[PDB]
């Protein structure tokens, strides 16, 4: 019925399926109700307290800005507990329609839980969302039944959960893992946030100190009662975390296994209740400690920097004046500079703050730190770039011109400096060409995903799982597939059911990595989008390319 | 009735709850008791939970045929 646009901010201490709505928005949007039995007194209280905005008995819309008989329409204002549905404006946000429960505040923003950023692909740097307000009762049933967070908990693109522990929660768990024990006062302060009771201490008495809990007993304070499940790195028995193996390379996967254990055997909302009890506990754990990063974290030593520069001037620069003169098939450059980057990462992960603030196994996020601490690497080349070869020859001649102090002491396409120590004017110009090419490729190049999604939806729109189970087109009533999954039948229900629009789900699951690849515009994410276009855009007529 | 799923889908659940709450809003008698609730959708949810709802469905097959069914014959009982 109504719609609303607003800037979003975060709030970690309300529930995952709750949304906070400003009062200026809330007191001007209405919900319509049909007055009848079981709600005469409850609506009479509201109209007496001047909380119903408008009215219509029959058809003549008389305002109230009258006693109630059964059978007319009351328009009251939005209050706590109603249902709206949220959508960031779907430029790429093809599946982000979420149903949330309303509370009202006095500020100007819309507050959401920080766990809902990745289901919406939003952040708090100026993003706005649209809220929509359902008026009809069958529309309320459809919104509450298809698009709630507990209904949509297991993803339909992948098999994973839409809710993952992110930035501050994972850091709180890591620092809760590197020290294992907690004294009585902080443990009882954390136990104020748990839904269960605090256990007896794991350590009752040492001769040195008093009693001490472990962090497994703190993490178990969010479980439901009589939980007993099992996964890869954990054993939970009798609603007690019996076993949890060491790691930081495994920790997020073990938490995901615990949540999928709870949501395979526990309830109608128990995984959401687990998150709603776990997240404020982790915030309140990290708050009396703090976490920061200093200049010492960013300063590689003189020895390790000398090794980096020696490995460059030994290995990388005599090779790059050979295999770049050959053609495109020699990406040995990338493997060798990746070896030197591995050496640099092994150097830089000795600082305790830097290893907790990134994902170590990720590679797109570990190249970005090598560019800051050590060398930038290759910036200019004449293979599949959006600039020509005359620019590259001009830059090589300019490299001869400006370094009149011992020219050809390295290559012109390799930057040896870092961001932390600063670039030359020549290195700044060479880096600025590469940055400009990435920016142009990310902005102008967003038309081939835009075309691909249109032509994908134009053909895949009307493919439905039917009531007998065969995946069929509906405009021609022809069989596309005999079964959607391989273990779906009428004894075993599955992730997909009859009536599911599997063609739209396939089109969106194909369009998401394309948009992600072009919005990144790395060399790897360029080659992947090339390999995807060479399958998805074949031509039935012979073009003899 | 054979050849189809013995589970109820989300699209049948949504329309059953919608028509039940629309019926309750039109002064229809409630088939169960009220533990102090006012929202009609939650009364329809309690009616579905206690299986006291009179309706019948017809699953249409693609070849023109169908299957009659009564709404208190499907499995709606699944926790996590």
């Amino acid at each position: 019925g109504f719609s609303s646009r607003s800037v979003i901010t975060g709030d970690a201490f309300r529930n995952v399926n709750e949304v906070g709505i400003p009062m200026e928005i809330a007191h001007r949007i209405t919900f319509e109700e049909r007055v009848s039995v079981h709600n005469i007194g409850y609506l009479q209280e509201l109209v007496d307290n001047k909380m119903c905005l408008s009215y219509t008995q029959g058809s003549t819309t008389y305002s109230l800005r009258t006693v109630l008989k059964p059978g007319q329409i009351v328009h009251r204002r939005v209050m706590d507990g109603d249902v709206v549905f949220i959508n960031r404006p779907p430029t790429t946000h093809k599946h982000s329609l979420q149903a949330l429960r309303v509370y009202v505040h006095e500020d100007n923003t819309v507050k959401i839980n920080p766990l809902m950023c990745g289901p919406l692909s939003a952040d708090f740097d100026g993003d706005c969302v649209h809220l929509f307000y359902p008026q009809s009762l069958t529309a309320k049933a459809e919104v509450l039944e298809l698009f709630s967070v507990d209904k949509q908990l297991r993803s339909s693109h992948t098999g994973q959960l839409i809710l993952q522990l992110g930035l501050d929660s994972l850091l709180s768990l890591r620092v809760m893992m590197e020290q294992v024990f907690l004294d009585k006062a902080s443990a009882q302060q954390l136990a104020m946030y748990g839904s269960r009771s605090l256990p007896s201490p794991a350590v009752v008495k040492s001769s040195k100190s008093g009693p001490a809990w472990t962090f497994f007993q703190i993490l178990q304070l969010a479980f439901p009662e009589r939980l007993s499940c099992r996964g890869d790195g954990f054993i939970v028995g009798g609603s007690d975390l019996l076993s949890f193996d060491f790691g930081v390379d495994a920790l997020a996967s073990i938490i995901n296994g615990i949540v999928t254990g709870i949501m395979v055997e526990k309830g109608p909302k128990e995984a959401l209740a687990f998150f709603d009890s776990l997240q404020p506990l982790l915030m309140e754990h990290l708050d009396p400690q703090g976490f920061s990063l200093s200049l010492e974290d960013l300063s590689m030593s003189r020895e390790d920097m000398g090794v980096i520069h020696n490995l460059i001037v030994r290995e990388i620069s005599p090779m790059v004046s050979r295999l770049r003169l050959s053609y495109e098939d020699e990406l040995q450059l990338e493997n060798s500079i990746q070896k030197v980057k591995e050496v640099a990462a092994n150097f830089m992960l000795k600082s305790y703050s830097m290893r907790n603030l990134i994902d170590i196994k990720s590679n797109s996020a570990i190249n970005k730190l090598v560019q800051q601490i050590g060398f930038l690497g290759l910036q200019l080349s004449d293979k599949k770039k959006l600039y020509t070869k005359t620019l590259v020859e001009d830059m090589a001649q300019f490299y001869k011109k400006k370094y009149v102090s011992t020219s050809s002491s390295g290559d012109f396409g390799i930057v040896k400096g870092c961001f932390f120590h600063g670039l030359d004017p020549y290195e700044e110009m060479a880096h600025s060409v590469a940055a400009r090419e990435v920016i142009v490729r990310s902005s102008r190049g967003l038309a081939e995903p835009g075309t691909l999604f249109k032509n994908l939806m134009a053909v895949l729109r009307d493919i439905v799982i039917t009531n007998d189970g065969t995946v069929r087109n509906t405009c021609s009533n022809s069989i596309v597939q005999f079964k959607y999954e391989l273990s779906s039948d009428n004894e075993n229900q599955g992730l997909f059911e009859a009536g599911d629009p599997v063609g739209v789900l396939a089109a969106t699951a194909m369009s998401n990595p394309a948009y992600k690849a072009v919005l990144d515009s790395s060399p790897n994410s360029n080659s992947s989008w090339e390999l995807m276009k060479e399958v998805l855009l074949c031509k039935v007529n012979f073009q003899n390319t | 009735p054979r050849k189809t799923s013995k589970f109820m889908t989300k699209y049948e659940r949504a329309r059953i709850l919608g028509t039940r709450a629309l019926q309750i809003s039109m002064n229809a008698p409630v088939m169960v008791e009220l533990e102090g609730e006012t929202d009609p959708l939650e009364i329809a949810m309690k009616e579905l939970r206690q299986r006291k709802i009179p309706f019948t469905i017809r699953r249409y097959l693609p070849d023109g045929s169908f299957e009659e069914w009564g709404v208190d014959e499907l499995i709606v009982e699944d926790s996590w």
């Binding site: 134009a458 439905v464 021609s476 | 019948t56 017809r58 249409y60």
Partner: peptide, 24 residues
């Protein structure tokens, strides 16, 4: 393909209405 050359080819070669409620 998912372009015009594939789309016009097949075009040349070639929930809702799934159930119904009623009283009982």
């Amino acid at each position: 393909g998912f372009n015009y050359g594939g789309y016009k080819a097949l075009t040349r070669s070639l929930t809702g209405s799934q159930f119904e409620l009623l009283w009982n």
